[PDB]
């Protein structure tokens, strides 16, 4: 392990890949799960051909390039582009052959079956992986949270989860994924920012208003009162600056964007806010252990990086659950990264080091033993 055999932990979450060797506290490779592909033509002799920009360089040439996630909400859409962000991960950040290493991958739960076995296959077959393991996100964020009791809410870039647990025992029927994450809120931010007259009809600036969002857009603790004092703009309005140099001013549009996490009717679905979803998970749980799910609501993921989330949570599940007892929420730092970090310590455990899908284990037995090891 650890630059030896050294299980590669590669968190292939939507929006961002986060990769490092086993035991690493910091995924040295972090870069957006994107593939830049040029739109306009260029007649210049001696110019980077560069048909397929990949990952973080596509952040540099966002104007020309069509930015494209190869994955969508855990579901891998484009497999060779997925292999572009992989092979770039393994040869330009990890800078090593997976042909030696186990590859501890990370994947969203409640996954259609091709996105486990093919996510493993392109590792086993295009790459060589002497071993590997695709892994459920929220549990590994509990590995960096390091606990075994409560309910983990991993809102990465694509999917919010509510994954319960009680002393190592998970409750699968009470696990709920949901599409409320940073990829969604920037579309809501797009439709709600243009009422001020600012249209950004290009993915280049979808990530830039997502950058606005990941800085400015917090969660209203109470919502319509922040909209009530959105009448008199005192501090809610703030100036942002573009890479062009232009200035934005956003007021109420700040807090209401991640209110779609909490009132998805702003998006316009059936979906309740994330607090009713964890509460709905605990509906499905057992009256002895439902107490320990209240006081141990865990937060995780890149969309959960925003201010005002967790206090609205303690307010609202207090409104939902028996307020006779306590509803503490545990929101550690590095919650986007705790998914990866707890994997980077999972591979360190030698009992896990027998829980790998080895090479011939994939080859002769099946791609369905991926499902027998990863559930």
């Amino acid at each position: 392990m650890d630059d030896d055999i050294a299980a590669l932990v590669v968190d292939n979450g939507s929006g961002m890949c986060k990769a490092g060797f086993a035991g690493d506290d910091a995924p040295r490779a972090v870069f957006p799960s994107i593939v830049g592909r040029p739109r306009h033509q260029g007649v210049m002799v001696g110019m980077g051909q560069k048909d397929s920009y990949v990952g973080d360089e596509a952040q540099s040439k966002r104007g020309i390039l069509t930015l494209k996630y190869p994955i969508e909400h855990g579901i891998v859409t484009n497999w060779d582009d997925m292999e572009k962000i992989w092979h770039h991960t393994f040869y330009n950040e990890l800078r090593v052959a997976p042909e030696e290493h186990p590859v501890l991958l990370t994947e969203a739960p409640l996954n259609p079956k091709a996105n486990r076995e093919k996510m493993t296959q392109i590792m086993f077959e295009t790459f060589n992986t002497p071993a590997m393991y695709v892994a459920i996100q929220a549990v590994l964020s509990l590995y960096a949270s390091g606990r075994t009791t409560g309910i983990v809410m991993d809102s990465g870039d694509g999917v919010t989860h509510t994954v319960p647990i009680y002393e190592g025992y998970a409750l699968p029927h009470a696990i709920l994924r949901l599409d409320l994450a940073g990829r969604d809120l920037t579309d809501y931010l797009m439709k709600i920012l243009t009422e001020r007259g600012y249209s950004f009809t290009t993915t280049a600036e979808r990530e830039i208003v997502r950058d606005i969002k990941e800085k400015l857009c917090y969660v209203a603790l109470d919502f319509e009162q922040e909209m009530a004092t959105a009448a008199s703009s005192s501090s809610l309005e703030k100036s942002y600056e573009l890479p062009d140099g232009q200035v934005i001013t956003i007021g109420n549009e700040r807090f209401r964007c991640p209110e779609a996490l909490f009132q998805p009717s702003f998006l316009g679905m059936e979906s309740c806010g994330i607090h009713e979803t964890t509460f709905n998970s605990i509906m499905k749980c057992d009256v002895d252990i439902r107490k320990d799910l209240y006081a141990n609501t865990v937060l995780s993921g890149g969309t959960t990086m925003y201010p005002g989330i967790a206090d609205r949570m303690q307010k609202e599940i207090t409104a939902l659950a028996p307020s006779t007892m306590k509803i503490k929420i545990i929101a550690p730092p590095e919650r986007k990264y705790s998914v990866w970090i707890g994997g980077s310590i999972l591979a360190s455990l030698s009992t896990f080091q027998q829980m790998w899908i080895s090479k011939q284990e994939y080859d002769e037995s099946g791609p369905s033993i991926v499902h027998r090891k990863c559930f």
């Binding site: 390091g146 310590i345 455990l349 009992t351």
Partner: protein
């Protein structure tokens, strides 16, 4: 018909007799374990905290059996501690100390009646069975 408040008195004396057992028994273990962990220069003033990680129980089983046991990841976190005691339990179920409430979390939590309930069963399988070297 007063068996109820008499149960509030009796059960207090149920576990009073069990604490008068388990404390002297903890010191039976304490001088027993400090006769062994002194080989690895570890001193026990408290079973429930010193051998709490599992790796320190692993140190004891490395002393008693005179062998080596794997030392997996340790830290602040629960999984860190449960894995360590799961290697102790690996060698203790190897020594047929059952999982009759003699647990990973029981050592991690320092459960007064099952941390000693585990390691006294280790005494009852050291001087009976081959937890020794």
């Amino acid at each position: 018909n007063d068996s109820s408040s008499a149960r509030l008195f009796e059960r207090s004396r149920i576990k009073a007799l069990a604490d008068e057992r388990e404390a002297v028994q903890k010191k039976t273990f304490t001088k027993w374990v400090n006769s062994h962990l002194a080989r690895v220069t570890c001193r026990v003033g408290d079973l429930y905290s010193d051998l709490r990680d599992g790796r320190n129980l692993l140190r004891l089983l490395e002393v008693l059996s005179g062998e080596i046991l794997p030392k997996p990841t340790k830290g602040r976190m629960r999984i860190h501690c449960l894995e360590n005691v799961d290697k102790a339990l690996q060698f203790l179920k190897e020594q047929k100390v059952h999982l009759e409430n003699m647990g990973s979390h029981d050592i991690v939590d320092g459960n007064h009646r099952l941390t000693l309930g585990l390691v006294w069963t280790i005494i009852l399988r050291f001087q009976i069975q081959d937890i020794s070297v």
